[PDB]
Structure 1
Amino acid sequence: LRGLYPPLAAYDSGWLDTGDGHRIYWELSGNPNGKPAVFIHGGPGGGISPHHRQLFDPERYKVLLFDQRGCGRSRPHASLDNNTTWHLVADIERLREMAGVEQWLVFGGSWGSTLALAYAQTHPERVSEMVLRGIFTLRKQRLHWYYQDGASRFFPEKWERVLSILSDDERKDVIAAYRQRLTSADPQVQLEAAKLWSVWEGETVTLLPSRESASFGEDDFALAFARIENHYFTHLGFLESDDQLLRNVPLIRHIPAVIVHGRYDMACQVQNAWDLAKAWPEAELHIVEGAGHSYDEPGILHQLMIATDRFAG
């Protein structure tokens, strides 16, 4: 199976002041004369890591990677002010103009596929092609599956830990219950909930268990991760309608796209990828058997590498 390209340092980076209170971190990697691509991380609030640079051929791609508002190296850390889907779409444009890119390929997995779709449907003429993984459209059925009743039935022993700090009444709406704790004035209260919320996802994003899931418990990461994720879900991704993203697919059906989704993705059900493909015939769908949610699941990674190399030659 195809794997990641070897490690490489970025060739340029900085912070872009948005003008409304945020300084967003960005970096350029690969070849400054290559094909332009933008990497959109997941979460929301997940951040980028050096490994994400290795997803593109260093010779053929010019990759712009950035940390979305409030997470990673973007300041202020864990800020929920002016932190919405539409501000992020605006930020992607600012980064575009700054890199002198007229049009580029959008690569996004999980929440990244969500923002990728929102961005593409808002600025169609700015997207040459798309590589989507672990489709997440933010419909209420998708939120309910992962945070109220669904994935919980496959990991009952883990779900029990997420509910441990909740009273019986709070358990009827876990998202809202965590929203209260993640936004209290007591930072110790916030952190206790942030850890539980983050680790739930870290341990259910891969087919088999991995020690690496523990990194989802680190204070700084967990705090921003939990707050931002919960903030966006509390507001239904700031969408006008439940199915806005699937409903506006007509605006981007002309754009070449590949969809990779693991059969046993417990964070985002394959149904989302099926529904998207149902509305987007032109798109190329790949349901990977034996794989979970994460991008580095062997079978999923293999398809992502083929997809980026293909759009490059």
Structure 2
Amino acid sequence: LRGLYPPLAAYDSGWLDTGDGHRIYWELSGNPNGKPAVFIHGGPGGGISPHHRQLFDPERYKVLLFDQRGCGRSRPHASLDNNTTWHLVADIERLREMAGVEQWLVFGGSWGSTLALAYAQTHPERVSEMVLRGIFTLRKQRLHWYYQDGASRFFPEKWERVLSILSDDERKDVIAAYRQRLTSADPQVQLEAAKLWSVWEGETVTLLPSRESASFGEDDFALAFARIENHYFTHLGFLESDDQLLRNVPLIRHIPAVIVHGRYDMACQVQNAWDLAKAWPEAELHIVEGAGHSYDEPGILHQLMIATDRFAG
């Protein structure tokens, strides 16, 4: 099974001012002359990690990675002002011009696949190929499954904790209920809800439980992760339609793509990958048996490495 390339430092980085109150962190890694690529992290509000650099051949790829508005090293931290899908799409173009790339490969998993599609459908001309994982299209059915009733039936003992702070009436709409707490004037109230919401996801993203899931509880990370995720979901990803992303696939069918999705991905159901593949015949679909949601699930990682090497030779 293929694994990550060895660790390496970014050869350059900085902060880009959006002009509307955001200074977003970015970093360039790999080969300054290599094939251009951009990494879209998940969440939203997930942030990048040094390991994401190791997802591409160090000598064949010029990888630009960045923290989306409000998370990671991007300032202001946990900010919900001017934080929408369309601003992020704008930011990607901005970052593209700066790095001086004419066209690049878009790599994105989970929310990253969502923003990748929105971006690709908005600027088809700028995408050479796409490597998508754990498809998430933001349909209400997708949000209901993960935050109202669905995954809850596979992890009832964990879902009981998420509901613990809610009154019986609030339980009918968990997203809305958490939205109030996450936007409370009391930071202690915000953090309590933020931790619960983040750990729920941290513990259901892998096939088997891992200690790693506890890092989703760190105050600063949890706070921005929850606020931003909940923000985007509260507004249905800022899409015109429930199925806008599937409805506009015609605009990118001509683009080479690979779709990797764990059979037992509990955050995003395989159904999403199947629906996408049905509308996108050209795309190469890979349903990884025995795998969960996370990019580092042995079987999912294997297909991603093979996918990136393939597009680079």
Both structures adopt the same fold (TM-score exceeding 0.5) = yes
Q: Shift of the alpha carbon at 1:4?
A: 0.0
Per-residue deviation, residues 45-74 of structure 1 (Å, max 9, x unmatched): 000000000000000000000000000000
* TM superposition shift of 1:76: 0.1
SS in structure 2 at match of 1:27: strand
C-alpha distance after superposition, 1:133-189 (max 9, x if no partner): 000000000000000000000000000000000000000000000000000000000
**Aligned-residue identity in percent:** 100
Q: Secondary structure at the match of 2:312?
A: coil
Provide the rounded CA distance (Å) in 2 between the counterparts of 1:62 and 1:101.
Answer: 10
- In the alignment, structure 1 segments of 5+ residues that lack a partner are none
State the alpha-carbon separation in 1 of the partners of residues 41 and 247 from structure 2: 23
| CA deviation profile, 1:61-109 (whole Å, cap 9, x unmatched) | 0000000000000000000000000000000000000000000000000
Residue in 1 that maps onto 2:200:
200
Q: Compute the TM-score of the two structures, normalised by the length of structure 1.
A: 1.00
Distance 2:122 2:187 in 1: 37
Query: 1:216 — aligned with what?
Result: 216
Q: What is the number of residues matched between the two proteins?
A: 313
Aligned to 1:223, the other structure's residue is in SS state: helix
Question: What RMSD in Å do the two structures reach over aligned CA positions?
Answer: 0.1
Deviation of the 1:22 alpha carbon: 0.3
How far apart, in 2, do the equivalents of 1:302 and 1:14 lie?
31
| Partner-residue secondary structure (3-state), 1:285 | strand
* Cα distance, 1:224 vs structure 2: 0.1
Distance 2:117 2:219 in 1: 31
Mapped to 1, the partners of 2:230 and 2:157 lie a distance apart of: 22
Residue aligned with 2:306, SS: helix
Q: Give, in whole Å, the separation in 1 of the partners of 2:237 and 2:257.
A: 23
Runs of 4+ in 1 over 6 A off after TM superposition: none
SS of the aligned residue for 2:58 comes to: coil
How far did residue 289 of structure 1 move?
0.1
Does 1:303 pair with 2:303? yes
Measured after TM superposition, the shift of residue 272 of structure 1 is 0.1
Distance in 2 between residues matched to 1:184 and 1:194, nearest whole Å? 11
User: What whole-Å deviation, never above 9, does each CA across 1:101-125 have from its counterpart, x for those lacking one?
Assistant: 0000000000000000000000000
Shift of 1:298: 0.1
Task: Supply the distance in 2 between the matched residues of 1:92 and 1:75 (Cα, whole angstroms).
Answer: 16
Alignment of 1:131-146 (within 5 A): 131-146=131-146
The Cα of 1:257 is off from its aligned counterpart by 0.1
CA distance in 1, matches of 2:247, 2:108: 19
Deviation per residue, 1:209-253 (Å, 9 max, x gap): 000000000000000000000000000000000000000000000
- Looking at structure 2, the residues matched to 94 and 264 of structure 1 have their Cα atoms a distance apart, in angstroms, of 36
- Displacement after TM superposition at 1:10 (Å): 0.1
Shift of 1:208: 0.1
Distance 1:304 1:153 in 2: 30
Distance 1:162 1:58 in 2: 41
Q: Secondary structure of the equivalent of 1:311? A: helix
Q: CA deviation at 1:192?
A: 0.1
CA distances 1:250-298 after superposition (whole Å, capped 9, x unpaired): 0000000000000000000000000000000000000000000000000
TM-score (norm 2): 1.00
CA distances 1:24-47 after superposition (whole Å, capped 9, x unpaired): 000000000000000000000000
Aligned residue number for residue 82 of structure 1: 82
Task: Please give the secondary structure, in 2, of the residue aligned with 1:306.
Answer: helix
